Write a protein that holds these residues in place. Structure first.
Motif, PDB file in Angstrom:
ATOM      1  N   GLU A 123      22.973  47.096  32.529  1.00  0.00           N
ATOM      2  CA  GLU A 123      21.982  46.516  33.425  1.00  0.00           C
ATOM      3  C   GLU A 123      22.694  45.852  34.599  1.00  0.00           C
ATOM      4  OE1 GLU A 123      18.420  44.781  35.069  1.00  0.00           O
ATOM      5  OE2 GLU A 123      19.312  46.660  34.361  1.00  0.00           O
ATOM      6  N   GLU A 124      23.658  44.993  34.287  1.00  0.00           N
ATOM      7  CA  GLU A 124      24.406  44.302  35.316  1.00  0.00           C
ATOM      8  C   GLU A 124      24.980  45.330  36.275  1.00  0.00           C
ATOM      9  OE1 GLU A 124      26.988  42.109  32.461  1.00  0.00           O
ATOM     10  OE2 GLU A 124      26.088  40.287  33.316  1.00  0.00           O
ATOM     11  N   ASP A 125      25.604  46.364  35.722  1.00  0.00           N
ATOM     12  CA  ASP A 125      26.200  47.420  36.550  1.00  0.00           C
ATOM     13  C   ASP A 125      25.213  48.020  37.547  1.00  0.00           C
ATOM     14  OD1 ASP A 125      29.022  47.848  35.701  1.00  0.00           O
ATOM     15  OD2 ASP A 125      28.086  48.189  33.742  1.00  0.00           O
ATOM     16  N   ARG A 126      24.017  48.329  37.065  1.00  0.00           N
ATOM     17  CA  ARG A 126      22.971  48.907  37.900  1.00  0.00           C
ATOM     18  C   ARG A 126      22.688  47.963  39.072  1.00  0.00           C
ATOM     19  NH1 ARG A 126      18.180  48.205  39.244  1.00  0.00           N
ATOM     20  NH2 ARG A 126      17.942  46.260  38.043  1.00  0.00           N
ATOM     21  N   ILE A 127      22.531  46.680  38.754  1.00  0.00           N
ATOM     22  CA  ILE A 127      22.262  45.655  39.759  1.00  0.00           C
ATOM     23  C   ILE A 127      23.372  45.604  40.791  1.00  0.00           C
ATOM     24  CG2 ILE A 127      21.919  43.235  40.234  1.00  0.00           C
ATOM     25  CD1 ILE A 127      20.805  42.824  37.527  1.00  0.00           C
ATOM     26  N   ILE A 128      24.600  45.562  40.297  1.00  0.00           N
ATOM     27  CA  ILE A 128      25.759  45.498  41.163  1.00  0.00           C
ATOM     28  C   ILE A 128      25.782  46.685  42.115  1.00  0.00           C
ATOM     29  CG2 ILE A 128      28.271  45.470  41.238  1.00  0.00           C
ATOM     30  CD1 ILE A 128      28.187  44.095  38.464  1.00  0.00           C
ATOM     31  N   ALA A 176      34.391  37.684  39.373  1.00  0.00           N
ATOM     32  CA  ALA A 176      34.194  38.621  38.278  1.00  0.00           C
ATOM     33  C   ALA A 176      33.692  39.951  38.831  1.00  0.00           C
ATOM     34  CB  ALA A 176      33.204  38.056  37.273  1.00  0.00           C
ATOM     35  N   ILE A 177      32.628  39.908  39.628  1.00  0.00           N
ATOM     36  CA  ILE A 177      32.103  41.133  40.211  1.00  0.00           C
ATOM     37  C   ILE A 177      33.195  41.795  41.056  1.00  0.00           C
ATOM     38  CG2 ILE A 177      30.566  42.107  41.918  1.00  0.00           C
ATOM     39  CD1 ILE A 177      29.593  39.180  39.643  1.00  0.00           C
ATOM     40  N   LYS A 178      33.800  41.046  41.973  1.00  0.00           N
ATOM     41  CA  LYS A 178      34.864  41.602  42.813  1.00  0.00           C
ATOM     42  C   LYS A 178      35.897  42.352  41.960  1.00  0.00           C
ATOM     43  CE  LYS A 178      37.381  38.725  45.239  1.00  0.00           C
ATOM     44  NZ  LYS A 178      38.624  37.936  45.432  1.00  0.00           N
ATOM     45  N   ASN A 179      36.247  41.782  40.813  1.00  0.00           N
ATOM     46  CA  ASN A 179      37.207  42.426  39.932  1.00  0.00           C
ATOM     47  C   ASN A 179      36.585  43.638  39.272  1.00  0.00           C
ATOM     48  OD1 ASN A 179      39.445  40.814  40.309  1.00  0.00           O
ATOM     49  ND2 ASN A 179      38.884  39.385  38.655  1.00  0.00           N
ATOM     50  N   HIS A 180      35.440  43.427  38.626  1.00  0.00           N
ATOM     51  CA  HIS A 180      34.732  44.503  37.942  1.00  0.00           C
ATOM     52  C   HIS A 180      34.554  45.715  38.848  1.00  0.00           C
ATOM     53  CE1 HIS A 180      32.426  46.287  34.813  1.00  0.00           C
ATOM     54  NE2 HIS A 180      31.296  46.303  35.493  1.00  0.00           N
ATOM     55  N   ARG A 215      29.759  41.583  49.593  1.00  0.00           N
ATOM     56  CA  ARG A 215      29.257  40.228  49.697  1.00  0.00           C
ATOM     57  C   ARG A 215      29.126  39.742  48.265  1.00  0.00           C
ATOM     58  NH1 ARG A 215      26.217  42.108  54.218  1.00  0.00           N
ATOM     59  NH2 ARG A 215      26.998  41.173  56.165  1.00  0.00           N
ATOM     60  N   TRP A 216      30.291  39.597  47.638  1.00  0.00           N
ATOM     61  CA  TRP A 216      30.411  39.164  46.258  1.00  0.00           C
ATOM     62  C   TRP A 216      29.616  37.908  45.973  1.00  0.00           C
ATOM     63  CZ3 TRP A 216      31.644  43.496  44.971  1.00  0.00           C
ATOM     64  CH2 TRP A 216      32.679  44.228  45.575  1.00  0.00           C
ATOM     65  N   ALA A 217      29.792  36.896  46.811  1.00  0.00           N
ATOM     66  CA  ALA A 217      29.077  35.643  46.631  1.00  0.00           C
ATOM     67  C   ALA A 217      27.581  35.921  46.567  1.00  0.00           C
ATOM     68  CB  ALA A 217      29.393  34.699  47.776  1.00  0.00           C
ATOM     69  N   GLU A 218      27.105  36.737  47.503  1.00  0.00           N
ATOM     70  CA  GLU A 218      25.693  37.088  47.575  1.00  0.00           C
ATOM     71  C   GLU A 218      25.253  37.765  46.291  1.00  0.00           C
ATOM     72  OE1 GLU A 218      22.861  35.987  48.639  1.00  0.00           O
ATOM     73  OE2 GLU A 218      24.045  35.884  50.494  1.00  0.00           O
ATOM     74  N   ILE A 219      25.924  38.863  45.970  1.00  0.00           N
ATOM     75  CA  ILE A 219      25.628  39.629  44.774  1.00  0.00           C
ATOM     76  C   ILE A 219      25.669  38.748  43.526  1.00  0.00           C
ATOM     77  CG2 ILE A 219      26.421  41.494  43.277  1.00  0.00           C
ATOM     78  CD1 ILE A 219      27.491  42.916  45.737  1.00  0.00           C
ATOM     79  N   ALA A 220      26.613  37.812  43.509  1.00  0.00           N
ATOM     80  CA  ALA A 220      26.790  36.916  42.374  1.00  0.00           C
ATOM     81  C   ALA A 220      25.530  36.154  42.011  1.00  0.00           C
ATOM     82  CB  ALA A 220      27.925  35.932  42.656  1.00  0.00           C
ATOM     83  N   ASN A 241      36.199  46.458  41.782  1.00  0.00           N
ATOM     84  CA  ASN A 241      37.477  47.034  42.193  1.00  0.00           C
ATOM     85  C   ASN A 241      38.251  47.833  41.139  1.00  0.00           C
ATOM     86  OD1 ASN A 241      37.517  46.419  44.956  1.00  0.00           O
ATOM     87  ND2 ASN A 241      38.173  44.302  44.546  1.00  0.00           N
ATOM     88  N   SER A 242      37.871  47.706  39.874  1.00  0.00           N
ATOM     89  CA  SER A 242      38.541  48.459  38.824  1.00  0.00           C
ATOM     90  C   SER A 242      37.483  49.202  38.018  1.00  0.00           C
ATOM     91  CB  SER A 242      39.354  47.526  37.914  1.00  0.00           C
ATOM     92  OG  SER A 242      38.521  46.618  37.208  1.00  0.00           O
ATOM     93  N   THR A 243      37.218  48.707  36.813  1.00  0.00           N
ATOM     94  CA  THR A 243      36.230  49.285  35.907  1.00  0.00           C
ATOM     95  C   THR A 243      35.142  50.087  36.620  1.00  0.00           C
ATOM     96  OG1 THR A 243      36.509  47.300  34.511  1.00  0.00           O
ATOM     97  CG2 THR A 243      34.693  48.793  33.961  1.00  0.00           C
ATOM     98  N   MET A 244      34.411  49.418  37.502  1.00  0.00           N
ATOM     99  CA  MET A 244      33.301  50.026  38.224  1.00  0.00           C
ATOM    100  C   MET A 244      33.519  51.174  39.193  1.00  0.00           C
ATOM    101  SD  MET A 244      30.043  47.934  39.376  1.00  0.00           S
ATOM    102  CE  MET A 244      29.334  49.509  39.779  1.00  0.00           C
ATOM    103  N   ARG A 245      34.709  51.318  39.756  1.00  0.00           N
ATOM    104  CA  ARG A 245      34.874  52.392  40.719  1.00  0.00           C
ATOM    105  C   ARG A 245      35.260  53.754  40.157  1.00  0.00           C
ATOM    106  NH1 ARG A 245      36.571  50.464  46.562  1.00  0.00           N
ATOM    107  NH2 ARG A 245      38.215  49.466  45.301  1.00  0.00           N
ATOM    108  N   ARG A 246      34.304  54.677  40.229  1.00  0.00           N
ATOM    109  CA  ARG A 246      34.477  56.049  39.771  1.00  0.00           C
ATOM    110  C   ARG A 246      34.589  56.896  41.035  1.00  0.00           C
ATOM    111  NH1 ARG A 246      34.449  53.572  34.774  1.00  0.00           N
ATOM    112  NH2 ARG A 246      32.353  52.773  34.264  1.00  0.00           N
TER     113      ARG A 246
END
Ligand SMILES: [K+]
Ligand SMILES: [K+]
Lengths: 115, 64, 64
Positions: free
Chosen positions: A74-79, A104-108, A89-94, A110-115
């Motif tokens: 769910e979080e992923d979809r939102i992100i 956390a998002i910025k990290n998520h 706009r990490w702060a915004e998205i946060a 930049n790694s895990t999330m980028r396909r």
DNA sequence: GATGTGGCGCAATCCTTAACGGACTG
DNA sequence: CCAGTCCGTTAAGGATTGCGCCACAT
């Protein structure tokens, strides 16, 4: 610039290493008793650490609200959805994610999330 | 022959491993298939059980 | 470093490999069980069918 | 005796994450 | 400047994974 380059850099007594349960403990105690502010002051209670470091350590790791759980779908979809609109706009998205810090998002992302 | 023993073994170890890497994949697949099969079967047993219990009650309804 | 780098990596390696060895042990188990019940259901399906068939002959062959 | 497996350490690499260093706001 | 925030960037080090040496079960 001169004073800032010295007071906040060269000083050989500035501990910029890892955080010990005690160090993290003093910050949690203080922040819990006097609130999550006045980091310059709070820092004075920590040998080697400056306010900024304490602040960043509290907001990203010690603050109880910060969730350390695995990222749900769910979080992923939102992100992803939000990033399409706002961008980095990490702060915004946060603000859209309950207990996740902008970092956390910025990290998520930049790694895990980028396909 | 030690040199030979090695060269041969290193070849064996790779074959052994490719084999196992495949076996593990094949296995992970069987888990899907079976679960699916098992699902349709459990369904069929229900069905048949109904058809059977019905046919029985039908007989038990015929007069001497 | 080097000395500690190695010690630390070796732990990570043993750990990683163990985890895998376990996941492959579960999957190997999950298959057996799934093969057990699957075989069981297959038999249950055979039984019910036979009965259904037999029962139906008896019914069609009734007096009239 | 010769061959197949399960372990293991090494290294190079893949992956995450903490948090440093500028820059901006009011 | 000050106290707070934000964000790109990257060192640090854990998780993987291909290679080869070994013990030893087959
Ligand atoms: K201090
Ligand atoms: K949040």
């Amino acid at each position: 610039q001169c004073q800032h380059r010295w007071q906040k850099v060269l000083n050989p007594e500035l501990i910029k290493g890892p955080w010990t349960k005690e160090e993290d403990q003093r910050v949690i105690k203080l922040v819990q008793k006097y609130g999550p502010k006045r980091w310059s002051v709070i820092a004075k209670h920590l040998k080697g650490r400056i306010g900024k470091q304490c602040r960043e350590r509290w907001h990203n790791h010690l603050n109880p609200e910060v969730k350390k759980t695995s990222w749900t779908e769910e979080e992923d979809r939102i992100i992803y959805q939000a990033h399409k609109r706002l961008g980095n706009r990490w702060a915004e998205i946060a603000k859209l994610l309950p207990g996740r810090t902008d970092n956390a998002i910025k990290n998520h992302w930049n790694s895990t999330m980028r396909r | 022959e030690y040199k030979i023993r090695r060269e041969r073994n290193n070849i064996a170890v790779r074959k052994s491993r490719d084999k196992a890497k495949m076996r593990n994949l094949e296995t992970q697949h069987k888990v899907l298939e079976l679960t699916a099969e098992n699902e349709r079967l459990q369904k069929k047993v229900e069905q048949l059980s109904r058809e059977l219990s019905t046919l029985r009650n039908l007989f038990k309804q015929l007069p001497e």
